[PDB]
């Protein structure tokens, strides 16, 4: 090609990222589903993770996360964050799970030393969901 011809712009396979991925630093309760959820999260079992969080009764979700062990509430929250990042219609039903994980395990993940670095994907997903709120405010006006 010519020597005076400028180089065109080409991204190629450059990784486009945002500025918000901080990935670097007797019974009497119900019949819940938390053994299913716990041995979904001990492995990486997307299939039975989907069969445990297609349950959407609020008291079942509530005491399920209450009976959950708090050392893996952070990875339940990571799985929920990645699923609502990918599928956008899940944000309605699945963020009921993410608000209950914060309310119940409000001590474990305030005692964790790097909250944003450990659940970066939630922060990036909610930042990109709520960043454009003035724009669709102007749109619906």
């Amino acid at each position: 090609k010519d020597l005076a011809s400028a180089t065109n712009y080409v991204e190629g396979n450059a990784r486009v990222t945002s500025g918000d991925n901080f990935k670097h630093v007797t019974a009497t309760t119900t019949g819940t589903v938390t053994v299913i959820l716990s041995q979904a999260l001990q492995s990486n079992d997307h299939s039975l993770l989907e069969t445990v969080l297609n349950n959407r009764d609020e008291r079942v979700i509530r005491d399920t996360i209450f009976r959950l062990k708090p050392a893996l509430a952070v990875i339940l929250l990571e799985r929920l964050a990645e699923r609502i990042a990918r599928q956008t219609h899940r944000q309605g039903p699945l963020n009921v799970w993410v608000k209950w994980c914060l309310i119940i395990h409000g001590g474990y993940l305030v005692s964790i030393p790097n909250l944003m670095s450990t659940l970066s994907s939630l922060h990036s997903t909610l930042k990109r969901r709520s960043d454009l709120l003035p724009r669709l405010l102007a749109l619906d006006a």
Binding site: G106, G107, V110, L137, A138, A141
Partner: protein, 548 residues
């Protein structure tokens, strides 16, 4: 150039050992050791020893005795080893070697015939160097470095008995001519205030620096370029900096002339014969952040005033960018004389202080930028008005409008005049957030709440607000929530800050439901006026009329 300053034989062991340091003793028989226990046998003692070392075995120990030779000891087992005399004059500073690293038959008198670490192994006779008063051993390629008071430097390597280099080094009577921490240099201290680093591979000075103050017992630490130094008639062992993977914190070197300062670690209490107390407990020299602490060996501050670019035909200055003036006529002598003109009998009046300051600095009396000023000068005139004399109407108005006020601002709540207090809220450019939060939560329910929330938001980071607004009671925050719900943007985000910083669980319910209802209607009105701001052909048959 100092370090963290406090604390007013096998050379690589520590504690949990028995005695890896057996050393000689002043005004005693020969030598001793202690524990935190190994036996103290004899290395053919009772001579004129001045130091004592071992072969890094502690049961092949010795007494380095001034008799031209040395033998072995049995400090653990009971079985001695044989020896062989070389000289008979002074071997008081004998240092037995490792498995063929650095050894020669140099006693005291220029007879450095090379040998090995054995009782009968020999080498060449490398006694060629002159009468050396400072002979040390380093590990460049294990080498005897001689500094001679016939003055001349030489460096022989006891790896093939090869004289590596040598020159004419005019070294006088020294204090400590100790080899460097990486061994590449020679730190030789002059008597009172100086320590020069010379190149110990070519026998030449590389950096001849002065030191801070009096120091006598100086030696290089196990550091990059740092030394330790104890005072002569002082127990003060300070540190200075002119091993690099995971460095030392204690048990670095034992050469000191304090009150029996043997076996000097960081916690240097349990000595080898002395049984003394301990001191500082820091590590060696770091890269560059500890020299902001140890900012010593320079204390020569003067009164720095603003100079000017030198007038070499400055009359062709070509359209100066000021309003009307060209250069302020600087009067630092009148700046100093204004102190004498102010510290007078105007003990309640603004006739001989405020007029004096506004005559020395001809400004609009609330404005900067006609500067020529010093922070020590402003601090001393602020001290002279904080003395026998806030009733001046020009001086203490034009100098909270100065970015160098230096922390005499704490009584700004403790004096309460309205216009001077609001001016010290808005314009005083260094304010303590403790007093700012106290003034914020000592509410007088006025617009100065907005004026104090403004500054507490616009000069402190949010987490530094949160950690120091944890330091509040609960009646303050309950009345704060009550006053917000009663009766704006910066106080909304301040309300966000108080909710983030009160904590998680320990709350009440009625205040929470009141705040919930209030902010629900607040989001509703914010949504509707955001909507308001974002809100700012022919038929087939007609019938009409025309003029008649």
């Amino acid at each position: 150039d100092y370090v963290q300053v406090a604390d007013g034989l096998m050379v690589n062991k520590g504690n949990y050992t028995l005695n890896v340091i057996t050393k000689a003793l002043e005004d005693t028989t020969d030598t001793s050791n202690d524990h935190l226990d190994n036996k103290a046998y004899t290395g053919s003692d009772e001579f004129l020893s001045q130091y004592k070392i071992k072969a890094k075995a502690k049961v092949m120990s010795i007494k380095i005795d001034t008799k031209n030779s040395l033998v072995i000891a049995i400090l653990q087992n009971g079985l001695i080893e044989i020896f062989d005399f070389k000289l008979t004059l002074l071997h008081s500073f004998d240092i037995s070697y490792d498995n063929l690293k650095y050894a020669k038959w140099f006693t005291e008198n220029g007879t450095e015939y090379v040998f090995v670490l054995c009782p009968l192994q020999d080498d060449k006779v490398c006694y060629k160097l002159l009468e050396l008063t400072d002979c040390g051993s380093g590990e460049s390629s294990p080498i005897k470095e001689l500094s001679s008071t016939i003055i001349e430097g030489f460096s022989f390597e006891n790896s093939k008995l090869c004289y590596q280099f040598g020159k004419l080094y005019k070294l006088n009577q020294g204090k400590i001519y100790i080899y460097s921490l990486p061994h590449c240099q020679l730190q030789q201290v002059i008597e009172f205030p100086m320590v020069d680093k010379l190149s110990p591979g070519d026998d030449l000075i590389s950096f001849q620096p002065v030191s801070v103050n009096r120091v006598l017992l100086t030696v290089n630490n196990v550091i990059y370029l740092l030394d330790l130094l104890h005072c002569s008639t002082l127990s003060q062992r300070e540190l200075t900096h002119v091993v690099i993977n995971s460095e030392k914190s204690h048990n670095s070197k034992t050469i000191a002339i304090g009150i029996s300062t043997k076996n000097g670690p960081n916690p240097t209490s349990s000595l080898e014969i002395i049984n003394i107390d301990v001191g500082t407990n820091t590590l060696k020299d770091s890269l560059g952040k500890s020299f902001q602490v140890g900012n010593n060996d320079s204390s020569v501050i003067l009164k720095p005033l603003f100079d000017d670019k030198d007038i070499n035909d400055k009359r062709v200055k070509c359209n100066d960018v000021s309003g009307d003036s060209s250069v302020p006529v600087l009067h630092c002598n009148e700046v100093i004389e204004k102190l004498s003109a102010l510290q007078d009998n105007d003990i309640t009046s603004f006739d001989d202080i405020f007029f004096k300051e506004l005559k020395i600095k001809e400004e609009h009396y609330t404005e900067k930028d006609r500067y020529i000023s010093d922070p020590g000068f402003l601090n001393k005139v602020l001290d002279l008005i904080f003395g026998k004399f806030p009733k001046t109407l020009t001086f203490l108005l034009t100098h909270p409008l100065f970015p160098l006020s230096r922390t005499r601002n704490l009584l700004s709540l403790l004096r309460d005049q309205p216009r001077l207090f609001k001016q010290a809220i808005v314009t005083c450019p260094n304010l303590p957030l403790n007093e700012l939060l106290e003034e914020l939560f000592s509410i007088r329910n006025r617009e100065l709440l907005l004026d104090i929330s403004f500054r507490i938001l616009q000069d402190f980071t949010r987490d530094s607000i949160k950690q120091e607004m944890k330091k509040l009671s609960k009646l303050d925050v309950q009345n704060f929530i009550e006053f917000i719900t009663s009766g704006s943007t910066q106080l909304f985000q301040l309300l966000s800050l108080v909710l983030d910083s009160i904590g998680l669980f320990s709350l009440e319910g009625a205040l929470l439901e009141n705040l919930t209802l209030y902010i629900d209607k607040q989001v509703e009105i914010a949504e509707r006026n955001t909507e308001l701001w974002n809100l700012i052909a022919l038929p087939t048959y007609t019938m009409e009329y025309l003029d008649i």
